[PDB]
Amino acid sequence: REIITLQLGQCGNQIGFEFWKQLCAEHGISPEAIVEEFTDRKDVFFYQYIPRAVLLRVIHSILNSPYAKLYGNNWASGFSQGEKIHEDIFDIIDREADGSDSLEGFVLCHSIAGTGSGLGSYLLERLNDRYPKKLVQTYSVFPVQPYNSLLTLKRLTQNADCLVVLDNTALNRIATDRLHIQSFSQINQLVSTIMSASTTTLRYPGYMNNDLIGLIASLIPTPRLHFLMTGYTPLTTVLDVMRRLLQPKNVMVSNHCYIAILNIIQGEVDPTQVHKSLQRIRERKLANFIPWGPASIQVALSRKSPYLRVSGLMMANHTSISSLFERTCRQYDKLRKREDNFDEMDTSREIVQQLIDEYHAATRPDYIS
Amino acid sequence: REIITLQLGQCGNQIGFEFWKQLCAEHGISPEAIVEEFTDRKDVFFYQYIPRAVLLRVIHSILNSPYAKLYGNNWASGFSQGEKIHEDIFDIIDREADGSDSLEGFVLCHSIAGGTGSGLGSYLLERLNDRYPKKLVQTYSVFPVQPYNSLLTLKRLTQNADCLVVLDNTALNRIATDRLHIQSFSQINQLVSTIMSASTTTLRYPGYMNNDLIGLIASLIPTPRLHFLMTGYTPLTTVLDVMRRLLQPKNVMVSNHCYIAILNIIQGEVDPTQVHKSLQRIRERKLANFIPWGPASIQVALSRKSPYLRVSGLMMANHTSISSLFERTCRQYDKLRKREDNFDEMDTSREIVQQLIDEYHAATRPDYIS
Amino acid sequence: LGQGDFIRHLMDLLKPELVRPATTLYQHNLTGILETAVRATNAQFDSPEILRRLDVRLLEDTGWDVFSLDYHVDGPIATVFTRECMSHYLRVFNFLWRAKRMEYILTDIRKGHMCNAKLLRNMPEFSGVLHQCHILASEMVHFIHQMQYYITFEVLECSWDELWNKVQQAQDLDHIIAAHEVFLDTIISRCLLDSDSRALLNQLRAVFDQIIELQNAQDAIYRAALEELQRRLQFEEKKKEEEEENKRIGEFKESIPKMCSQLRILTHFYQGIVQQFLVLLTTDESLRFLSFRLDFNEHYKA
Amino acid sequence: EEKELVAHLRSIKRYFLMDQGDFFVHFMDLAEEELRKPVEDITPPRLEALLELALRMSTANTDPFKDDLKIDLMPHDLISGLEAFSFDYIVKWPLSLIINRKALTRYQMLFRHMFYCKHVERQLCSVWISNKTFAGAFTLRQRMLNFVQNIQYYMMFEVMEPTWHILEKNLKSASNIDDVLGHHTGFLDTCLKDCMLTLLKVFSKLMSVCVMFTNCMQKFFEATINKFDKNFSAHLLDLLARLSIYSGMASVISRLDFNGFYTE
């Protein structure tokens, strides 16, 4: 099962270009697409080695970079032009699909803040037409700006089978708090750390989680509550790492309860004190979950690349993600009272309200019905 | 049995010269046509050493090359000029033929895209079908007013040449930009000569099977019409990896559907006991489809690399998809027929290529017979 | 036959001789032909000693039933072969000679068709029955051109590898005899020349016979179309009467459905002897690798 | 050192304990259609051809001892077609003193119990995409998925792993073969004890309603989804009732429920 990734807009290119650089080094692969001599499953993202990427003036910046041998501002402009090249970019994706053994997903990296917004809205619609059995995960990045942002949310709530939020605001704080930057060339270094460590269980096979649909169906219980946030502590036992992930200082997000937690421990920690910490987290009650359904916390170990110390990443499905929407929803109405049908915006307006209500209904002891 | 080759036009002459360079390098033969000291059956293509070539401006370039010691743009103009010098070239061809012990075939390397080579090869194919009735004719034709010449060459090639191997410059340029990063003729010609030299590998290094051209032809081509083949060259390690990388569309030099015949040539020192396991697993995973009417299988053979010169491999396929290419040309001809003595020969050519495309399209049906 | 280059030229020179009956065949004539082949092919660059023993012998019909090579060996080297390895090789050489002429026949037919259609491509009433002549060929050459591979890879190249591996490490000349003696007990077993596999080989011979009957029923249909074509050439070139030939041309079209009933009943019986052949392979283990070679893409077995 | 043993036990663990993930997600994906067929209907020449192709294409290619995996279809189930599949391992003479037919079928008893639990939540997670473009079954799928993926985690990282981690160290201080023969059977009798393999047949019948519920959803009623709920939830409560009454076998409850749910 192979995962063909997409990169749209200046954001998607920059994070993806730095995502591949983090992966190319984590394996024994020279930037010349040649394996270095110097066990790790590398067929998912690489084709025997060439990465399975379909990019879409930053492109020239990549073609001049040493990695050259490895391959307007309106939302309407993005959706319009995307229709004019419907056959062009689908020729590439189709020829890249059948050449692969068995396609599994479409990890799409785009920012909802110019053309990446309108084009990505076009793709996520068109993929569900032709490919109805392919998961579509998206590493969307949060920042007329209120308009282009929410319009993509209309598509991301009914097409994308998963979504990982990464807002530049909360990232900028961690850029200022523990890195003291005051730049895009620095915050993306943290984004590339989150994207690479997200698929560490696919590239390093273990007991479980050897396929993308194994990481998805565990967290996302229902087709609607499909938004996830991340947590990465290393910026020492398993109890030291588990306690730091639950602190609000580490989450990349600016009653409320969790739905499902998955912990990624990339250390060489002995697998015997893994149940003791989980036992302790239950006692001190450092996190609460949904009251209606049985919600449990899962922890997964892996092995660090010898070619490159304990780290940790947490995939979270938290109801407090509804706050980020309200900030978009709020500023929209203000721009709606300040200035061929203008119905798509209002129709998108309604469905976002259905989503936020579903979150605030998820924290109720009677979320069923 | 000796094979004589012919080189027409600039493209044909250049690819033939590079093929001869490659083949002389594979053996111990200096550019001065003198064997070097430093098993390989070399009598087929060389005469005791001189190559059996018939070259027909770039000749001056070859004569200035260190290998000097080794020897308009219309179709109608080419055909006329070839008719003018019939006896002149045929005296050379006949002396080189009867000088040989037992002639076997006539390899023809030319570009059908346009110029004089197209019409000259047309005329030569017709005249060879006339004179010699028992000689196989294989053609290493290279695909690109151009549509006119191309379709005329296809018309003459679909009945005369008893076999044919297509080479499209578009796919070669695509591969060059992908995995060679060129942006040139002198660069794509390298890969072309590599494929050509690897094509006739089993004839020069004797093995259990495939000691003659008929052994290569009669296995693939089931009927006299379906005689267009495509090539694949994966090394740009087990035999299973080679066979899995060969059947990928990323490597085939081609711009429902199924296969008619597949042949693999492995030049490495691999363990020959794992080939049956490779075929078993390929059948298990169902990576390729075959014709539904007749029993068609895949054949594999091994050889030895030139010791004077690692695991490589080549694949020759009879795929029904090749017809698609013709359609394009056909299409363009129609577009050229409505935009601008008798002008009926082009119409007959269109008719026969339509016949061929219809036959290809009907070949992929469970009732292709009748 | 591990040379290929030499046996190819040797089958082209013995063709005009062996077609005659055996009574007119005398050994002293063939030796000049064999000596000619060794001088023409690549077998000339070879040790003169081993070429002194390579000769012919006549088994005691047709010339393709009594010809065989011997390679007699006497002296100290004779304690490795011991008159039994020379009685097994000839037991093998017959099977490799038959499966070699049954292939050069099927590449001669496949050569005729490439020069056939280059002449009579102007008679659209004959291609309807000429087509069944092509499909039956390409269905017959597969069964033979595939069995050749099982002979090369799964019988010769595989069983010889277990011999050259137990020789470069053996010693005392008694691990060599035992490694060369079992090398002749697998080839007899991997090929169908065993004692209890008798029902299988006699079943294969019928398929070997159907290849000959096609080659006899082909040139009859082939030549009968060249005569009618040649008469049609002269019946119009000298004049450029008209009613006395339309009955000859008219009756010629009426004889076509007669020939079609031949290739329709010859094919339907060829498939009945192959689909029966496969059932006999499911009987003793290496034969399973043959059932896959023939049944690739499941052209049979529905 | 010669005919090494510790570098020989690890290879068995990759397939028998399903440590290697890239090999199973690619094998069941290829040999599923040919396993749902009934017993005495599948040709072993068809499975083994897929097993060989499953190893080489995966990342298990870097394994010197991979050529000792054989298919062995058991006649009895875990007291057909799918419930009658299990690997077999053949070893040479000198190592056959340690890992023998008496102490290899135990490796084959705790394998099928893990190939069953890996199969159900492989297809239970497969229906997850079919429904995603009548609406009350999503909260029931949550009740079974959070049960198998809460048994598998306890079965892989806190049961066999800990015992294996001990054995590796417990073989560095060995002194004689009749001790290694004790640190081995002392490891297999513990894995079969900490797991539910030693009775607790309520798990067997509990798995039937999970796999069968996948069949109902695969037939695309409203009175049948709620029928599975009252049937599965009742079977689950029988488990935690017996898992709690004892003298780990107690920490399993903390893995099943984490939110105080099932406090009845």
Ligand SMILES: Nc1nc2c(ncn2[C@@H]2O[C@H](COP(=O)(O)OP(=O)(O)O)[C@@H](O)[C@H]2O)c(=O)[nH]1
């Ligand atoms: N995190 C992050 N976000 C970026 C980066 N570069 C651009 N962005 C986001 O992308 C948005 C601008 O998108 P833009 O480049 O105009 O899209 P385009 O019109 O398709 O080129 C801004 O709102 C940023 O938030 C980066 O390096 N890191």
Ligand SMILES: Nc1nc2c(ncn2[C@@H]2O[C@H](COP(=O)(O)OP(=O)(O)O)[C@@H](O)[C@H]2O)c(=O)[nH]1
């Ligand atoms: N692949 C390949 N094609 C070539 C090369 N050189 C020329 N050609 C083809 O040959 C055609 C030109 O033929 P031309 O020389 O004008 O024929 P002429 O008029 O008879 O001399 C072009 O369309 C090219 O596609 C080469 O080195 N490689």
